[PDB]
Design an enzyme around this catalytic site. Structure first.
Site, PDB file in Angstrom:
ATOM      1  N   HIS A  17      20.210  75.143  31.711  1.00  0.00           N
ATOM      2  CA  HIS A  17      19.909  74.947  33.118  1.00  0.00           C
ATOM      3  C   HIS A  17      18.477  75.282  33.521  1.00  0.00           C
ATOM      4  CE1 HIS A  17      24.153  76.240  32.465  1.00  0.00           C
ATOM      5  NE2 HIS A  17      24.421  75.114  33.104  1.00  0.00           N
ATOM      6  N   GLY A  63      18.636  79.684  47.315  1.00  0.00           N
ATOM      7  CA  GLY A  63      19.547  78.673  46.808  1.00  0.00           C
ATOM      8  C   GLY A  63      19.042  77.250  46.956  1.00  0.00           C
ATOM      9  N   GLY A 107      17.282  84.249  52.017  1.00  0.00           N
ATOM     10  CA  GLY A 107      17.949  83.060  52.517  1.00  0.00           C
ATOM     11  C   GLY A 107      18.563  83.313  53.879  1.00  0.00           C
ATOM     12  N   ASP A 154      22.119  81.960  62.704  1.00  0.00           N
ATOM     13  CA  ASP A 154      23.252  81.806  63.606  1.00  0.00           C
ATOM     14  C   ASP A 154      24.070  83.085  63.583  1.00  0.00           C
ATOM     15  OD1 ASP A 154      22.693  79.102  62.165  1.00  0.00           O
ATOM     16  OD2 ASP A 154      23.812  78.501  63.971  1.00  0.00           O
TER      17      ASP A 154
END
Ligand SMILES: Clc1nc(SCc2ccccc2)c2[nH]cnc2n1
Lengths: 233, 233, 233, 233, 233, 233
Positions: free
Chosen positions: F4, F20, F89, F204
């Site tokens: 990967h 991510g 993130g 949020d």
């Protein structure tokens, strides 16, 4: 000797009475035993050894919760060679089948603890007392005229439950009261091939909110000592 | 009437003996009862009513496994008003202190089933029998001169175990044999507030022997049968 | 040659049709097979061998619940060398995709049992049937005119569920009906490299309580039987 | 005013120190605290309020085990208005990165107990301390020239482990030692929006077997006593 | 439109092909589709729409892991109206019943994830594909001269497994290979009433250690692509 | 080189910044780093090496979910010699102690994944960051004038949750927001003796339901970047 008990080997008789509260255990040594010499006092957790009706008996506090009870019962069996462990104490009733003053003999100890699953293949260990002690408690009771209530109890890791809504279910499945050590004691004793039994005195009904007076409580607990010591002889 | 029993109301006496095998049920009926009558036969799962020494008693098969045992016991109590249920089945020995034809009284039934976690809030339920029935078994067996070894059994969802390496752990924790129904019988009778007790005749030795034939599983346990019949008198 | 089956090796053909109810197994032998002979009858659990369209087929009852089904299925495969197991039975519809009288092919069997976790590393075993058998059900249903419903079933350890509030969720996840053995049949056949498939008949609604008239009950079950035997010819 | 604490409201300072052994708590009162009074003594579990370098410090024993520790911490928070809870005590090292006389700050407490699954939806509660208190331990230790060891601990229901083979895995996952209370303290402080940290002194190595429980104990126990009062000052 | 897809509504055809690798998805678009068109590209996760033999299909990348796959499949169904989901990918074989270049159809996906217990009552969800899609895949492979291997896969949360010692037991229970999404894709599809199927190409044998040469890898993948494209036609 | 990651050995500095979304990784490289070089791209998962204030720093994307995260983090540490990993993130806030634009630092990552039970003996692994990194973040925050909110986060396997009724209880136990990887980052680092920490910015609030604008979103995110690069300055 062991990190939790101060006694020298041989200080304990082979039969021992157990309560979570050591001052409760110190009260047994004084009001009921003759010779009576404090034998252990690590962490202020007292134990005694003395004579009741000329027969030798030991006493020992075990503290609160499965894990604490397990620590002391394990050392009592492996290091001090106690053969019979008779637990007494208070429990909150959850069943309509029992009420204040009743003495509950615990033929099984359910639990929300993980300890027996760690002990027992991640399966459901049925934690039970030794049968002949239960038989002896029944006989000694009738000899004294005590209406012994016999069922399960639920040993919880929480004094302040997060599942009070579940008390009705537990009562349905024949749990007469909630306490916090029987399942640990019952499992430790089956682990180490010892003879154990738990007796519980009803001083508070978690459901009918009924409760006694602090003198009826010392009255009731007195009525349980007598049966516990009469059955150790 | 119910999906699994086709007896009339009042057919079953309030006291009932149970075996998984309806042919052992039929065997007891023909060999031990006066005025024996077959009262149910759904799915070929026989049940019978008759008199033993002048007194009425019923017999019912319950099949194999907790699920099947639970079906019949639920219907016996809720529809047919049976009040005392005494299982007299077969088990497999795991300690060396029990032999090929020994009788065990299960004071507790551990399990690898999920059924009790489903009924009981994902916690550990101590599946246990009614104490008064335990007492009646112990004294009647002594009276009659039948050796009754007393301890826990393990009720498994498996006859052919995937965990044979754990038999010794189980035996260490006071499990004298393995069967497949005690825990369900006990749990259902706690749920429905009825009196239940399991007795077990060894039919296989999981360690140090082999096994009885199907015909032997029916006819080789008359002492257990007679202990049971004498208990209900 | 096993404790629950008294047939000889060779008595069972390599493909066996299974039902929970041995009397139902008896009906099928009598009505649909030529030359049928009872080959086993331990615990009244009948099994037969006979012929259909000249093809050798065996029938065997397996009782109620995953534990009972696992026993028989294990013995059929390991001792009696059965290679194809085709199970029929009734089920309780939970989903709007089916109605009473439908025949369901279970391509997945969920469960509340712990057995597959014990079998399978404490993980989630997807219990599934043999795909070649499932193709044989589909082509035979088409030939016979049967509108074959296909989806998952849920195999429960309870006939009298304690989780009836959950049937909508179960149905949302493509569970068409509830029964009691499918997961165990599937898991045992995966363990033992055998081919297995479960077909179920919708006899009543767990969610509406609507049920089939007795006449409709026999007729829909007959349709399922014909499908199975035709599948095996 | 609570089941397990004798004091009057307002007797505890908002900052409180915690040790399982009430005799070490009593020790700190008379060796380290100015004007030290015994505010509670139920069940021989003692508590104290005094001054350390003039400033307000309270002291409380929490017993042995997650369930014993939870009761007290719950009552200290919800009744006696305690806001900062610093637990100090012993632990058994299992990691190569620490030796005896080392002091450990628990950035996390892992557990073999079920209590946090019961508290936390059957999920994985990552039981942590309050970062403020942990910042003040690292700064105070750095000032006092104390080489602080910083990593996870493992809070067990078992002092006498049944999983000693597991100790290397815990070490690899940064578990420096085993004790019995931090995961309960941490989750109770999380549940109750309080601030807690746990500090740990190596009194014995479980792997390398080395031990220091007769004299070098209170030499390094005191080194940890000073760190605790100095960060509460 | 959704947090992870920026196609406009109606951009996705109701039939969609899936893969973990957005570049393999790109490979399928460039080389097999007419009128091909990238339709989404959030997080570098491409999705395309094009035509194969006059029939419009769509391709989407879904990432690695049940968590990732579930996100894209949920949005594909609920927002972009996708009805049929066919995942193609590689998998590491564990069963000797499969060899290199074999395509596997997963009629069931087992898992070590907790997601299905979270979705499903803490019970066992047997995650399965839509039967009619599985049927179509069999019909197409048979037309194309491809020998479809059919059985279970084990969808794991781990690429670098901690339980490699268990692969033999998985293979025995009819798990043909290990991948990472199938159980999630199947459960989402069942939750949301959509048709899913997972096909699996074997480029490495996790235990035999056989491996394809990178030039055989494109050949091998290309066979799966045509099969998958041929069955949406 | 790994399945990967497309980089050569030494293409990574031993401090990596993780997000991510690889497009946010590449956004960082363009706007914040000197001479940023793309060093990997397998699966469209971009990583970079670059300089910030003359300091070598690396960036790597890791996908959504614990499973994807654990893949890349493992390869980064074992193969590419990354010793320090910092995750940034978005995260949806659930606690009333945080609001839009706030930056949370995770001192613990709770989860509904089974991954840590599998890794860690079916017990509770308290997934926690490295303490030096958490200090360096707290100190860098102060110097930058940022009001670092500090508490547990909840890593879920679900983006679309099935337990939104549980969010309040999480908040109560000091869970500030929900994300999807932190528990896997921490567990892998603890497994592999590596140092890691997660910081997330509140876009949020999942409770009160307020949301930043995509111009406010960019500035809010840029703010976290500056923080992360300054602590790895
Ligand atoms: C009666 N006997 C046994 S022995 C099992 C067993 C014996 C021999 C070979 C394999 C398995 C039981 N096991 C569970 N329930 C039981 N009831």
């Amino acid at each position: 000797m062991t990190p939790h008990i101060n006694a020298k080997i041989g200080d304990f008789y082979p039969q021992c009475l157990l309560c979570g509260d050591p001052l409760r255990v110190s009260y047994i040594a004084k009001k009921f035993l003759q010779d009576a010499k404090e034998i252990t006092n690590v962490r202020n957790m007292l134990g005694f050894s003395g004579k009741y009706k000329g027969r030798g008996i030991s006493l020992m506090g075990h503290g609160m919760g499965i894990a604490s009870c397990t620590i002391y019962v394990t050392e009592l069996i492996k290091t001090y060679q106690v053969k019979e462990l008779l637990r007494i104490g208070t429990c909150g009733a959850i069943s309509p089948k029992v009420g204040l003053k009743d003495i509950i003999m615990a033929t099984g100890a359910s639990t929300d603890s993980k300890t027996n699953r760690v002990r027992f293949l991640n399966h459901d260990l049925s934690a039970t007392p030794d049968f002949e002690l239960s038989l002896r408690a029944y006989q000694t009771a009738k000899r004294l005229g005590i209406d012994l209530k016999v069922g399960n109890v639920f040993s919880s890791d929480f004094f302040y439950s997060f599942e009070t809504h579940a008390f009705d279910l537990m009562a349905k499945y024949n749990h007469l009261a909630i306490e916090m050590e029987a399942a640990g004691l019952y499992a430790t004793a089956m682990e180490l091939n010892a003879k154990a039994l738990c007796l519980c005195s009803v001083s508070d009904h978690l459901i009918t909110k009924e409760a006694l007076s602090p003198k009826e409580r010392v009255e009731s607990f007195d009525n349980m000592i007598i049966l516990a010591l009469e059955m150790m002889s």
